[PDB]
Design an enzyme around this catalytic site. Structure first.
Site, PDB file in Angstrom:
ATOM      1  N   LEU A 259     -16.574   5.743 -12.321  1.00  0.00           N
ATOM      2  CA  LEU A 259     -17.297   4.531 -12.708  1.00  0.00           C
ATOM      3  C   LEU A 259     -18.755   4.855 -13.041  1.00  0.00           C
ATOM      4  O   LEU A 259     -19.315   4.333 -14.001  1.00  0.00           O
ATOM      5  CB  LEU A 259     -17.219   3.501 -11.594  1.00  0.00           C
ATOM      6  CG  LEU A 259     -16.013   2.545 -11.555  1.00  0.00           C
ATOM      7  CD1 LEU A 259     -15.053   2.671 -12.756  1.00  0.00           C
ATOM      8  CD2 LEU A 259     -15.284   2.625 -10.225  1.00  0.00           C
TER       9      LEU A 259
ATOM     10  N   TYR B 154     -26.731   9.852  -4.186  1.00  0.00           N
ATOM     11  CA  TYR B 154     -25.667  10.283  -3.267  1.00  0.00           C
ATOM     12  C   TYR B 154     -24.543  11.150  -3.877  1.00  0.00           C
ATOM     13  O   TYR B 154     -24.195  12.184  -3.330  1.00  0.00           O
ATOM     14  CB  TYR B 154     -25.023   9.022  -2.636  1.00  0.00           C
ATOM     15  CG  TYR B 154     -25.680   7.719  -3.069  1.00  0.00           C
ATOM     16  CD1 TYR B 154     -25.518   7.229  -4.367  1.00  0.00           C
ATOM     17  CD2 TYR B 154     -26.502   7.001  -2.194  1.00  0.00           C
ATOM     18  CE1 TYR B 154     -26.141   6.047  -4.775  1.00  0.00           C
ATOM     19  CE2 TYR B 154     -27.120   5.819  -2.588  1.00  0.00           C
ATOM     20  CZ  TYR B 154     -26.940   5.347  -3.883  1.00  0.00           C
ATOM     21  OH  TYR B 154     -27.559   4.185  -4.295  1.00  0.00           O
ATOM     22  N   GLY B 155     -23.964  10.693  -4.984  1.00  0.00           N
ATOM     23  CA  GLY B 155     -22.809  11.344  -5.585  1.00  0.00           C
ATOM     24  C   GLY B 155     -22.271  10.562  -6.772  1.00  0.00           C
ATOM     25  O   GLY B 155     -22.943  10.401  -7.782  1.00  0.00           O
TER      26      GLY B 155
ATOM     27  N   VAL C 149     -19.091   7.345  -8.110  1.00  0.00           N
ATOM     28  CA  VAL C 149     -18.138   6.319  -7.714  1.00  0.00           C
ATOM     29  C   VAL C 149     -16.951   6.407  -8.635  1.00  0.00           C
ATOM     30  O   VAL C 149     -17.106   6.377  -9.841  1.00  0.00           O
ATOM     31  CB  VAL C 149     -18.720   4.893  -7.791  1.00  0.00           C
ATOM     32  CG1 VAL C 149     -17.716   3.887  -7.236  1.00  0.00           C
ATOM     33  CG2 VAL C 149     -20.021   4.797  -7.025  1.00  0.00           C
TER      34      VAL C 149
ATOM     35  N   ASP D 228     -33.480  -4.006  -2.285  1.00  0.00           N
ATOM     36  CA  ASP D 228     -33.494  -3.409  -3.635  1.00  0.00           C
ATOM     37  C   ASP D 228     -32.708  -4.218  -4.676  1.00  0.00           C
ATOM     38  O   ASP D 228     -31.908  -3.692  -5.472  1.00  0.00           O
ATOM     39  CB  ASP D 228     -33.053  -1.944  -3.538  1.00  0.00           C
ATOM     40  CG  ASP D 228     -33.425  -1.133  -4.774  1.00  0.00           C
ATOM     41  OD1 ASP D 228     -32.719  -0.133  -5.047  1.00  0.00           O
ATOM     42  OD2 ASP D 228     -34.382  -1.425  -5.519  1.00  0.00           O
TER      43      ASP D 228
HETATM   44  C1  LIG Z   1     -17.575  -1.169 -17.545  1.00  0.00           C
HETATM   45  O1  LIG Z   1     -18.003  -0.019 -16.737  1.00  0.00           O
HETATM   46  C2  LIG Z   1     -18.080  -0.134 -15.387  1.00  0.00           C
HETATM   47  C3  LIG Z   1     -18.868   0.762 -14.646  1.00  0.00           C
HETATM   48  C4  LIG Z   1     -18.938   0.643 -13.261  1.00  0.00           C
HETATM   49  C5  LIG Z   1     -18.263  -0.383 -12.627  1.00  0.00           C
HETATM   50  C6  LIG Z   1     -18.294  -0.505 -11.259  1.00  0.00           C
HETATM   51  O2  LIG Z   1     -17.508  -1.263 -10.575  1.00  0.00           O
HETATM   52  C7  LIG Z   1     -17.780  -1.167  -9.323  1.00  0.00           C
HETATM   53  N1  LIG Z   1     -17.233  -1.754  -8.252  1.00  0.00           N
HETATM   54  C8  LIG Z   1     -17.718  -1.513  -7.012  1.00  0.00           C
HETATM   55  N2  LIG Z   1     -18.755  -0.693  -6.834  1.00  0.00           N
HETATM   56  C9  LIG Z   1     -19.337  -0.099  -7.886  1.00  0.00           C
HETATM   57  N3  LIG Z   1     -20.373   0.703  -7.696  1.00  0.00           N
HETATM   58  C10 LIG Z   1     -20.767   1.087  -6.312  1.00  0.00           C
HETATM   59  C11 LIG Z   1     -21.522   0.052  -5.384  1.00  0.00           C
HETATM   60  O3  LIG Z   1     -20.778  -1.074  -4.760  1.00  0.00           O
HETATM   61  C12 LIG Z   1     -18.829  -0.318  -9.163  1.00  0.00           C
HETATM   62  C13 LIG Z   1     -19.216   0.061 -10.381  1.00  0.00           C
HETATM   63  C14 LIG Z   1     -20.257   1.099 -10.700  1.00  0.00           C
HETATM   64  C15 LIG Z   1     -20.144   2.394 -10.142  1.00  0.00           C
HETATM   65  C16 LIG Z   1     -21.152   3.366 -10.365  1.00  0.00           C
HETATM   66  C17 LIG Z   1     -22.278   3.054 -11.140  1.00  0.00           C
HETATM   67  O4  LIG Z   1     -23.295   4.017 -11.315  1.00  0.00           O
HETATM   68  C18 LIG Z   1     -23.788   3.963 -12.643  1.00  0.00           C
HETATM   69  C19 LIG Z   1     -22.427   1.750 -11.676  1.00  0.00           C
HETATM   70  C20 LIG Z   1     -21.405   0.760 -11.444  1.00  0.00           C
HETATM   71  C21 LIG Z   1     -17.458  -1.256 -13.371  1.00  0.00           C
HETATM   72  C22 LIG Z   1     -17.384  -1.133 -14.744  1.00  0.00           C
END
Ligand SMILES: COc1ccc(-c2oc3ncnc(NCCO)c3c2-c2ccc(OC)cc2)cc1
Length: 272
Positions: free
Chosen positions: A14, A19-20, A22, A126
């Site tokens: 995603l 941190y790393g 997702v 934040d």
């Molecule tokens: C259309 O592109 C995207 C990109 C990221 C996400 C996304 O969905 C998530 N659901 C739960 N957690 C999420 N992130 C962690 C914090 O709770 C996501 C994200 C997401 C994950 C990582 C991110 O770093 C750029 C930006 C969004 C959903 C759709």
């Protein structure tokens, strides 16, 4: 008792955090999706331990749901509600913003989430469009409790002093004072988020005396951008939120009584 329901495929990244990263995980049996926040700990233990702890306290429709966590060696895993709509950030057109009825609805949902957190004594610290995610129905969910902390415990408020957040969203007191109340700081950042949604631009790099755009605001020069792109009604709300003195700043109970906040703008979801 169903043989494979603890198995998840990791289907895509995603995104990358500090941190790393997702990853989107999907259940092999149910096809339920969840986000898996991966935190490389040899890269810190203080941040993630508190983040998990705070996440276990939370249950609200406008806060990203926490399903669990595993230690699997040197890696922490956080399993979280998948928000397929992505970041609110990506719904903001640079220099334009978004339609005022969408901005109002997102702002309503943001206040509902923030009221919830404050009611249980948690401050996010934040708030910004990058951390406000959107589900499949475009419901807003507050995410990332990595900087969150307790400001109220056993009905006793504790003042904050750690500087944190993101400069364009941060309240001026956090730059000027040794100690400050938590709730007005989150209110301020919500105001900068509202400004962004309505104008497609952030008003200043930081709310300091050395920042011209901030001085201009304090001198009430709303004939300038971003303020000139914003209708008089939401702008009046922003005059109440973006008040330098946090003791004079509008509170959330009073935001809910504001005229724009209560203005009928938006009909249901496309055939709801
Ligand atoms: C259309 O592109 C995207 C990109 C990221 C996400 C996304 O969905 C998530 N659901 C739960 N957690 C999420 N992130 C962690 C914090 O709770 C996501 C994200 C997401 C994950 C990582 C991110 O770093 C750029 C930006 C969004 C959903 C759709």
């Amino acid at each position: 008792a169903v043989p494979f329901v603890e198995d998840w495929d990791l289907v895509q990244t995603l995104g990358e955090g500090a941190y790393g990263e997702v990853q989107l995980a999907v259940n092999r049996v149910t096809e339920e999706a969840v986000a898996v926040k991966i935190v490389d700990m040899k890269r810190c233990p203080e941040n993630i331990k508190k983040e998990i702890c705070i996440n276990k306290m939370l249950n609200h429709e406008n806060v990203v749901k926490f399903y669990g966590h595993r230690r699997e060696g040197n890696i922490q895993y956080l399993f979280l509600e998948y928000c397929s709509g992505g970041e609110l950030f990506d719904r903001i057109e640079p220099d334009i913003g978004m339609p005022e009825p969408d901005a109002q609805r997102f702002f309503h949902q943001l206040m509902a989430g923030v009221v919830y957190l404050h009611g249980i004594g948690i401050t996010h610290r934040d708030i910004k469009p990058e951390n406000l995610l959107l589900d499949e129905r475009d419901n807003l969910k507050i995410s990332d409790f990595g900087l969150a902390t307790v400001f109220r415990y056993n009905n006793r408020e504790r003042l904050l002093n750690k500087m944190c957040g993101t400069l364009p969203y941060v309240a001026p007191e956090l730059l000027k004072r040794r100690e400050f109340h938590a709730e007005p700081v989150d209110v301020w950042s919500c105001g900068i988020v509202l400004t962004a949604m309505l104008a497609g631009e952030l008003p200043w790099d930081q709310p300091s005396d050395s920042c011209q755009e901030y001085s201009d605001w304090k001198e009430k020069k709303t004939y300038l951008n971003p303020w000139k792109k914003i209708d008089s009604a939401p702008l009046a709300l922003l005059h109440k939120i973006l008040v330098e003195n946090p003791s004079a700043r509008i509170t959330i109970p009073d935001i809910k009584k504001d005229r724009w906040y209560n203005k009928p703008l938006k009909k249901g979801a496309k055939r709801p």
